[PDB]
Design a protein around this ligand. Structure first.
Ligand SMILES: Nc1ncnc2c1ncn2[C@@H]1O[C@H](COP(=O)(O)OP(=O)(O)OP(=O)(O)O)[C@@H](O)[C@H]1O
Ligand SMILES: Nc1ncnc2c1ncn2[C@@H]1O[C@H](COP(=O)(O)OP(=O)(O)OP(=O)(O)O)[C@@H](O)[C@H]1O
Ligand SMILES: Nc1ncnc2c1ncn2[C@@H]1O[C@H](COP(=O)(O)OP(=O)(O)OP(=O)(O)O)[C@@H](O)[C@H]1O
Ligand SMILES: [Mg+2]
Ligand SMILES: [Mg+2]
Lengths: 506, 148, 74, 59
């Protein structure tokens, strides 16, 4: 590894990619953010992962929370710090004040602390140190310059001792100064900012590595989530364009379509079905999911527009018994309102469930529904995330898009995902003789030949029946064509008079 | 109630932001849905004739069945049409039927089979030789069958 | 924030009524609504025909059109 | 025909039945005179009609 600085892994998911390896050793990293952003969790996870994966003992310095509380709280993530304190791998050094005390003590204590922490480090043979909320200590009665000196003293002594430290700080503004006294920013070697941005009543947490003296790293904000497993970060820009590509085909669950697609979809491919409301994107999804079961493969249908009940009533009315797929343990249905979360969360729930069920096929009914509210750039980012995961995981994916205007739609997608996708299946209403018929079209396919016709198709209980193209029509896409005739009556089987039987016999 | 109807969600969207509105819709929508209450909601499109989207606020995906009403200019006259745009579990008719309104209420007549561009509000009437082919004068190939 | 556990994030609208605080966790509502095949009439028979035998009892129906088209009649 | 004529329409009326024709009308000193609809026209509404002048059934 060509980086001039030796780093230590945090094992926090995604952090080591962002930081190009982990935290520089022997130095201290300021981690700051507003209330509830995950500071304490980050620093705990840092010591914890350090002990459980490298047998690197840790010293945790707390100025406000209580040692019982830090232990009580870590149970949220299923961590038993008490056991580690016991085995002597972890030492929480209580520096909080007394609920009964005086006033005055923030610098000789800053010496008392230095000397203290050195004892603990020395005694436990510690390699990692987390100081939680140094801020609160001079929050006794101090001004910027006093803070800069004291911090510097601490960081400095720590570097001498040889310890790799994480120091936590508070901020009041999500985009204002880095930390309270507008002085910690420059005194630390590395700075990490945890943000919990509002924006439209939803909250989005992001982590940023602002600086790391000595090495490179990923720049900017990265969305992360706090779960039962702690911090989880997605470096969506760290995802590489090295997904495996096969020529293998798979069925769509509709034979005629398969023909149209020159032999079915590619296993390794992202398929997109768009059309106005009512055109039947949901039917195709149903049929694509069912097909992976009839072939004893696992598939997940993430539904964001219909209930699990409704999905079933409707599916059964199209043939296909979703009930069975469920039992046979071949099909898994999810279901969730796009509003019941932020994109980041959603993205993780999807990943999560793909790991626990190892599908071979996945279907997102209505990306266009997940786009409700969110900004286009946040949405596109979500799409590249789910799309790319699927791709590198050899999982075939069928995504749905409802277009905002039926008939006359001038772009495949309103969100312009159209380049992120491999195959595009297009559904549309055609006004033919005072009636609304449907048409299906394989708009594009990357490695195949696919049919170029805009075939009309009907929906029955049997499902989708793909008929013929509207050859004697112009202005098809317009949605209400013009009929023109060089013919129509031309053969195909003219031979008039009595050409039929009726129900009795034939 | 067993049934609920909201006359003009589109009037409730007055002022409010689209995201606050969508949130309201999902609100009254899902409540009704989980409560086994059949609900009929109303939406007045901002433009008569030529409307390119079912709803301006994009609720049409949060809904199961869509009934669409539209003016059709026929011979210097303003007539109505009704169309069952979509229905999730059923088959529904695909015709854009004309319909009148009287004291008796709504009478749903026939489709405008001999027109083009109806969706638009101003069709193009178009028989100019109906489906019996330019062979209405049936050639005269039939100049033999009858004799003396 | 709630140190130690989880919780829904973000803002949730609420109303102060005669029954005190009432909060609607609109993002906490689940996509588990019951779905039947039972039909019901529209009040218009011909309509019922067009809809393949009436509206589903379990359903959200939407009537759109220009002003004056007759949504209010339906 | 290269002229700007007017038309009036009772677009909607809540309790009554009203006429659905788009009637041509002129303005004089006498006031508004409401004549007939443009029966033999298309896309009236659009403002720029197209008279049909259908060659009937053409026999
Ligand atoms: N199991 C869990 N699953 C999901 N979120 C959790 C879980 N446990 C805690 N959280 C969340 O993580 C947060 C904890 O924040 P944390 O204690 O890490 O420090 P902080 O917010 O940085 O600083 P402060 O000491 O000011 O609160 C809580 O606000 C809560 O939202
Ligand atoms: N049993 C059936 N028989 C005939 N047609 C049906 C049947 N079930 C559904 N349909 C038709 O299919 C349509 C349902 O559309 P579908 O569920 O495939 O999803 P969509 O059009 O892609 O998306 P959305 O339903 O959210 O608008 C109905 O509007 C209707 O015309
Ligand atoms: N007794 C009646 N006889 C014939 N037509 C009537 C009668 N009453 C009303 N109408 C017609 O029906 C229309 C009334 O529309 P309606 O009250 O159903 O609601 P809408 O069109 O959905 O919404 P809005 O009235 O706000 O525009 C009138 O514009 C008119 O053409
Ligand atoms: Mg659907
Ligand atoms: Mg009204």
């Amino acid at each position: 590894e060509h980086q001039a600085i030796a780093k230590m892994r945090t094992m926090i998911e995604g952090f080591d990619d962002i930081s190009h390896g982990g935290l520089p050793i022997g130095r201290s990293t300021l981690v700051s953010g507003t209330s509830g952003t995950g500071k304490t969790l980050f620093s705990i996870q840092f010591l914890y992962n350090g002990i459980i994966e490298f047998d690197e003992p840790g010293v945790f310095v707390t100025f406000e929370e209580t040692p019982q509380d830090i232990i009580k709280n870590a149970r949220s993530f299923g961590w038993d710090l008490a056991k580690l304190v016991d085995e002597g791998k972890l030492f929480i050094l209580d520096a909080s004040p007394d609920p009964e005390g005086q006033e005055v003590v923030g610098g000789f204590d800053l010496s008392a602390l230095i000397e203290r922490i050195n004892y603990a480090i020395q005694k436990y043979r510690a390699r990692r140190v987390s100081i939680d909320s140094v801020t609160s200590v001079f929050q006794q009665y101090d001004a910027s310059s006093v803070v800069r000196r004291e911090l510097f003293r601490l960081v400095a002594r720590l570097k001498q001792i040889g310890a790799t430290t994480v120091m936590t700080t508070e901020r009041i503004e999500e985009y204002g100064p880095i930390a309270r006294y507008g002085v910690e920013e420059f005194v630390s070697d590395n700075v990490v900012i945890l943000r919990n941005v509002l924006e439209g009543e939803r909250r989005r947490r992001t982590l940023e590595i602002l600086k790391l003296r000595g090495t490179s790293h990923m720049k900017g904000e990265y969305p992360f989530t706090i779960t039962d497993h702690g911090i989880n970060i997605f470096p969506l820009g760290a995802m590489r364009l090295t997904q495996r590509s096969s020529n293998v085909r798979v069925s769509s669950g509709v034979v005629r379509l398969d023909e149209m697609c020159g032999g079915g979809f590619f296993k390794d491919s992202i398929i997109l079905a768009t059309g106005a409301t009512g055109t039947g994107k949901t039917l195709l999804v149903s049929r694509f999911v069912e097909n992976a079961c009839a072939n004893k493969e696992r598939a997940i249908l993430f539904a964001y527009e219909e209930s699990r009940a409704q999905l079933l009533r409707n599916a059964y009315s199209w043939g296909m018994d979703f009930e069975e797929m469920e039992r046979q343990n071949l099909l898994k249905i999810v279901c969730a309102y796009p509003e019941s979360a932020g994109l980041e969360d959603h993205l993780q729930i999807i990943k999560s469930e793909i790991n626990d069920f190892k599908p071979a096929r996945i279907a997102i009914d209505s990306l266009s529904a997940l786009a409700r509210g969110v900004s286009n750039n946040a949405f596109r980012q979500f799409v590249i995330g789910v799309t790319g995961y699927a791709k590198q995981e050899e999982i075939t994916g069928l995504f749905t898009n409802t277009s905002d205007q039926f008939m006359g739609a001038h772009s495949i997608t309103d969100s312009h995902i159209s380049t992120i996708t491999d195959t595009i299946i297009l559904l549309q209403y055609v006004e033919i003789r005072g009636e609304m018929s449907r048409a299906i079209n394989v708009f594009k396919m990357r490695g195949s030949w696919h049919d170029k016709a805009i075939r009309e198709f009907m929906i029955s209980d049997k499902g989708p029946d793909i008929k013929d193209s509207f050859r004697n029509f112009e202005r098809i896409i317009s949605g209400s064509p013009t009929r023109i005739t060089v013919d129509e009556k031309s053969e195909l089987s003219r031979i008039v008079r009595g050409v039929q039987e009726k129900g009795p016999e034939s």
